[PDB]
Design a protein around this motif. Structure first.
Motif, PDB file in Angstrom:
ATOM      1  N   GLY A  43       0.825  -1.199   0.000  1.00 28.89           N
ATOM      2  CA  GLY A  43       0.000   0.000   0.000  1.00 28.89           C
ATOM      3  C   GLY A  43       0.852   1.238   0.000  1.00 28.89           C
ATOM      4  N   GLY A  44       0.613   2.123   0.941  1.00 31.96           N
ATOM      5  CA  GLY A  44       1.415   3.311   1.061  1.00 31.96           C
ATOM      6  C   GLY A  44       1.145   4.306  -0.042  1.00 31.96           C
ATOM      7  N   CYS A  45       2.150   4.566  -0.847  1.00 30.45           N
ATOM      8  CA  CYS A  45       2.059   5.585  -1.879  1.00 30.45           C
ATOM      9  C   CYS A  45       1.237   5.101  -3.059  1.00 30.45           C
ATOM     10  CB  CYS A  45       3.437   6.027  -2.334  1.00 30.45           C
ATOM     11  SG  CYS A  45       3.456   7.665  -3.175  1.00 30.45           S
ATOM     12  N   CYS A  46       0.850   3.845  -3.023  1.00 30.83           N
ATOM     13  CA  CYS A  46      -0.009   3.252  -4.062  1.00 30.83           C
ATOM     14  C   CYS A  46      -1.376   3.948  -4.181  1.00 30.83           C
ATOM     15  CB  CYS A  46      -0.181   1.751  -3.867  1.00 30.83           C
ATOM     16  SG  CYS A  46       1.354   0.820  -4.079  1.00 30.83           S
ATOM     17  N   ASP A  75       5.733  -2.491  -6.817  1.00 31.20           N
ATOM     18  CA  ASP A  75       6.280  -3.366  -5.774  1.00 31.20           C
ATOM     19  C   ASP A  75       5.711  -3.000  -4.413  1.00 31.20           C
ATOM     20  OD1 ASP A  75       8.822  -1.872  -4.133  1.00 31.20           O
ATOM     21  OD2 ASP A  75       8.458  -1.075  -6.111  1.00 31.20           O
ATOM     22  N   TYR A  76       5.315  -1.751  -4.257  1.00 32.29           N
ATOM     23  CA  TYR A  76       4.694  -1.305  -3.018  1.00 32.29           C
ATOM     24  C   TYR A  76       3.227  -1.679  -3.018  1.00 32.29           C
ATOM     25  CZ  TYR A  76       8.737   1.828  -2.409  1.00 32.29           C
ATOM     26  OH  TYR A  76      10.011   2.354  -2.271  1.00 32.29           O
TER      27      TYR A  76
END
Length: 17
Positions: A1-4, A15-16
């Motif tokens: 997730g994150g910056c996705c 990859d995130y």
């Protein structure tokens, strides 16, 4: 997730995702 949550990251770094 994150910056996705941002197309900028998700389109270049799956990859995130």
């Amino acid at each position: 997730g994150g910056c996705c949550s941002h197309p900028a990251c998700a389109a270049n770094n799956q990859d995130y995702c």
